Amino acid sequence: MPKRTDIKSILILGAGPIVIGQACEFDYSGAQACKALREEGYRVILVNSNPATIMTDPEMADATYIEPIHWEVVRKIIEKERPDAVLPTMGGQTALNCALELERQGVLEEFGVTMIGATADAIDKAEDRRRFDVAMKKIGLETARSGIAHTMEEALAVAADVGFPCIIRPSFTMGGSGGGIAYNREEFEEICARGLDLSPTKELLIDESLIGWKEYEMEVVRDKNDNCIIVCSIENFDAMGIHTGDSITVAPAQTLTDKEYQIMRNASMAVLREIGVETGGSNVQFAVNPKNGRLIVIEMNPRVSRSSALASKATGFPIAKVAAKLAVGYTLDELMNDITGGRTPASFEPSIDYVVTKIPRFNFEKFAGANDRLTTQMKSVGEVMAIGRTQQESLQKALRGLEVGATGFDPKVSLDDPEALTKIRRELKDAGADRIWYIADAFRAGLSVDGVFNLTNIDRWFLVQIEELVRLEEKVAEVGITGLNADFLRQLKRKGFADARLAKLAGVREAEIRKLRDQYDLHPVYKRVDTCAAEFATDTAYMYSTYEEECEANPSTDREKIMVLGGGPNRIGQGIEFDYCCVHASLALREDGYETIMVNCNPETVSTDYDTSDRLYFEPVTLEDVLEIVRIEKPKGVIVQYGGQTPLKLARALEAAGVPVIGTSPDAIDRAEDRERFQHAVERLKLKQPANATVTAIEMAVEKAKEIGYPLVVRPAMEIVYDEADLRRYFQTAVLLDHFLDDAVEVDVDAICDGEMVLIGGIMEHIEQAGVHSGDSACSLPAYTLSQEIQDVMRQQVQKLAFELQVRGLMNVQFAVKNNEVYLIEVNPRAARTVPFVSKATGVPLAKVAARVMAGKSLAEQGVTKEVIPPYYSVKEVVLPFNKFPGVDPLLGPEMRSTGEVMGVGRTFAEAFAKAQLGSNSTMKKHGRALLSVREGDKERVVDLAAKLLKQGFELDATHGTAIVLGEAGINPRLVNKVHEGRPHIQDRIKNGEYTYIINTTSGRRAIEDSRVIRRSALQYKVHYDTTLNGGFATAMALNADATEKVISVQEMHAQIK
Amino acid sequence: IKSALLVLEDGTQFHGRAIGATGSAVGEVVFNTSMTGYQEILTDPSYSRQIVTLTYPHIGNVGTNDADEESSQVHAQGLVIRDLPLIASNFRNTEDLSSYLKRHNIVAIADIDTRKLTRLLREKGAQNGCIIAGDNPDAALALEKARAFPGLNGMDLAKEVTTAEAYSWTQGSWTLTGGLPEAKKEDELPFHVVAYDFGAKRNILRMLVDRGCRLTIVPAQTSAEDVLKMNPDGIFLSNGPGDPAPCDYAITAIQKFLETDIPVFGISLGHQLLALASGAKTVKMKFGHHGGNHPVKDVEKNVVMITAQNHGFAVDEATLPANLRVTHKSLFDGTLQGIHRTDKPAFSFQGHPEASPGPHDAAPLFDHFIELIEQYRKT
């Protein structure tokens, strides 16, 4: 059967703000679905609180709702758009959970909404761990010995049975959320408490250990005719015990005989059949004992996933698109295979002629007190992917594409370190993020493949390859540049060695190796992705580099080309925002008639979807890889301002190599990026900036400091020193020096300069004061407290800066307003993370406009010359990953730690903030008891916040000093003991659920370290808390609004724009 | 440095490394898309006189083992891969690939641009070639041998791989837990099937046995007469190498069996022989079908099955006599995959229901056979 006709309109549940374990893969999927269903003629309605997604672009769907993803809110959308059906398998766990809640709530029944893709029962079958387990035994599939628990007591008993260490896995969670490995009782209780609370169904599955077994995944697609295919198989590099998401993985599987692979392939199909996924894809995970091939089923995810994205990129088979279609009645045999020119059907199993490698990206450096060992709970914040003709080539390209500074197997320990083997050993035996490099160190240190195996459980098949690469490195080091003949170099290149890695080994510059390649005429060739191992031709240009004979690039001589450089893997601070920009640059220029070439290696993104551009090079974004592309494409221009820091840093070297960089110059970029260069410009501009000073020595610092005045913003990390004694203190632990603008409003300004004029894209006033990173601050567009007069001043300074710095395309300027004076914090001469939010809030596609400007079309020529001020408020709020690393003090500061964000649209500020707060998953309540514990400097404004809470119906508790201050003003909160004061104290009160809200502000290293328990408990016990007075006020205002009262679509919002 | 070189009829040269026996190899060059299963491939008699190229770069990851052999020897004329792994890593491995090739005296080459090779074959069709592995591979020589190759068109290879004398087979399928099971006692098998050995894969036998068949394997040229005398519950037409067309003996015998009511079932080659024997026409494909991901639609039921294919020739669908009904077609190219006699209990399938290697999707083809048999015995 073909498409469904008893369905016209479809609601798609988006995933929400990016968080660890639930990332960009969902925008890629959501967008695929939107696209697919749209092409089929369905009316598409979708909801996604995350503004930095292509799927929320108004032109991608019929009714776009950027609203909090809460069933009450979604009901309003339903009741409001009356969709015939709902597709809940394209939005991660958030979508599955929402779907089931809407279901639970009768909401679906209420409005006659048919669930497509997967049924509620199907979902539950796979999501309820108990149900899943029963299902496997029923199909004769083996599962680990285990037990279900709904309380601690139950938990403990299962443990008593399975023993330690044991695996804890909550029902209705993913990415390992709420789970872990308990090696002891202590760890056991903690993890258990954590998951029971997190589990949407207050249920856990506790299993015996299979740690060290091989880990495998299979991506399956099934149609209503019962047609079923394996789209891809994945073999994990890291063994069972380390979440797939935090593991190095490869495609296709490598160490299974055909016989074992069929058994697994058969099991995978059986599982979908038993679970009930009839129209869609699913991921099925397994454990295999390398010693005997014994197969164990671990889980199944009834939806698209992070693996399905990897899998789609790996094979060229667009899983989510296909799935959306299947959800509407189509069958596989009916759809055509995209990449094969539609020549073949979608009913086939891909075969690939290369090896795909994925490597997770971590950010442990941003979470000091965190446990940095890899486990079953994901901790990674992104991932890179690489394609190579061989595993070695594949692995190495991925290493250089990771954006961690590696050039491949850079050494971590010194050969002369007497303790080296001992350090290596620990790293191996207890994996952390750097395990991979340590594996190579182990080989340099004298450990054997068997020795490494024993500690890591990583299959020898991979280990021997790494070892062989080390040995190759030793030869390079030995023969030096002199030994780098053509044959040898070719050989090294074929194995994935980067010119940079070889340069370090031969003690020369990277450019020297490159040059040598040029001399030898040693350049890579390009192969295309085709889903079929070259069995059929392709009309698509999805390519990867390798060192081989035949090149499949066949670049055009026809079109003028524009290259867009991506940001590689996502990391904190370098999210999807930058990719949204790359995507818009591509869509716009292509629409404009240019031939668009994308350079990126993030498997989770829309930028790496072949549909997004004319040509896609799935390569590491490095000087070496880019120059090779350029070398053969010879583009008209290259865009380096859209991908974040990654391409930004290659700017100079690219130009230096004669690359045609468009938009703001590499020099210009540096003028803004170099503090000094920047200080002059400001100076020349007669602009205000905090007093500063580079201090070399300690004492030079204590004196300079006196000059600057306290407090101080010590940027070498980031810290705020309050006093002389603090200075030395820091120094002890520990250089630019800057007066910290205390009690200031932080403001961000996005703008475009075409050399003729400057367009203000948006003035966003932060809720949190200067001192809390902008990436972690909630913000409002338009400003909610800044005078027009002062904004006008900021507008003029932006212009002054724009023209002086020679900006051409996007720029972002950051200020601090203190005492009616504008101060400059910084200029980011490129696309900033606020660009999507502003575009959404204002209806103007800034990245599309700035990209045209960069390409040559003025703002005047485009008809985009006036700043837009929406008739409603747009509030952006963020989501922080502290819940993933409970050992970290969950407080805000000068360094960014957030992973994502949501947007709230309201008639008023209070209304927008409320929707933003809710969208961010705040557990804020409208009643209860609030705990106030503020710093000296806040003691004064607290009174008012306290009055506000009072008028709302809250009761109040407070600590000593704060109570003292309230009493004096006429407010008598109930006194609470500080942990050291006695009992009960706040921790007890928090642990015992007494509060529904906490406001705790602090100041000073010592005071912070001391108050750490408040924040930590608050987060643990799920109590809403603010760590800024400014945030408290805002929260207070929203108390007056109702986020579920009214909803608006993006199209409506943009229509209201006059 | 142990050089190896492969040269195609067209002059195209691939310089790589020797991973098997020293010497030369001439044959039809084919490409195979199977990501797993290289041993079963190599041991497939249907590969006789063909140089096999695997599209999946790493070949040998799991080593080799005796249960993964589809016949008594290595049938491939030669092997062309992109990369031979440093080690074999599988609990089932008994010997690394290279060692295995050396032992079977197979000329093999590694380290060549297999994708280039594959694209050439696809675009320009199958080509004959020569691989020379030794000290100074002479390219002009290779080119010579390749060119001098006769070709597989009109070449009957079935006669060359067929068993000398008849024999009995009563062994079933391997299991993870039990491995290759002990052969069954004749009394244990309900039916008796007589099987024409046109270069039959062991798994066909194994799987028929699994279904209650006691078998008697016969040379390709065995006479119908001699066959009818055995009182077979069914007749099975095996898979095999070369052109099916030049096999007059078989076609003749097959025709003899069709005048009867005995159930007949052929696989791949046996499928074409049946088709011919029924008056159909066979062709040699541009490059053929070799891989384990090939979509095949059962037109009666309208379902798709992922299959294992190994064929260089096909049965023309436009020439089908009215007594032959079309039961399956390839989804990749619409080519003919199955046929059933409208008047006789005879049918066949172009792919490999026995996989080995490959998806088990088509296994049920056998079932129909059984059914036919059971019902032939009811009489």
Ligand SMILES: Nc1ncnc2c1ncn2[C@@H]1O[C@H](COP(=O)(O)OP(=O)(O)O)[C@@H](O)[C@H]1O
């Ligand atoms: N019995 C077990 N022993 C050891 N590790 C396990 C076991 N079960 C699961 N794991 C590990 O935990 C990870 C997460 O479990 P999974 O069931 O996939 O949870 P989630 O749905 O959160 O991804 C697996 O990828 C695997 O590495």
Ligand SMILES: Nc1ncnc2c1ncn2[C@@H]1O[C@H](COP(=O)(O)OP(=O)(O)O)[C@@H](O)[C@H]1O
């Ligand atoms: N002089 C200062 N006074 C107050 N806050 C400041 C000052 N300098 C920096 N900050 C704070 O630190 C954050 C990060 O500083 P910034 O120079 O923008 O670094 P980054 O390159 O990480 O964006 C700002 O967003 C702001 O809250």
Ligand SMILES: CC[N+](CC)(CC)CC
């Ligand atoms: C991972 C996404 N959440 C659960 C589905 C946790 C933040 C959204 C509430």
Ligand SMILES: NCCC[C@H](N)C(=O)O
């Ligand atoms: N916009 C940052 C998140 C706010 C968090 N509740 C805090 O106040 O620490």
Ligand SMILES: [Cl-]
């Ligand atoms: Cl979750």
Ligand SMILES: [Cl-]
């Ligand atoms: Cl076991």
Ligand SMILES: [Cl-]
């Ligand atoms: Cl932690």
Ligand SMILES: [Cl-]
């Ligand atoms: Cl080659």
Ligand SMILES: [K+]
């Ligand atoms: K309906």
Ligand SMILES: [K+]
């Ligand atoms: K699950």
Ligand SMILES: [K+]
């Ligand atoms: K079990």
Ligand SMILES: [K+]
């Ligand atoms: K793993």
Ligand SMILES: [K+]
């Ligand atoms: K997974």
Ligand SMILES: [K+]
């Ligand atoms: K701020």
Ligand SMILES: [K+]
């Ligand atoms: K910056």
Ligand SMILES: [K+]
């Ligand atoms: K070569």
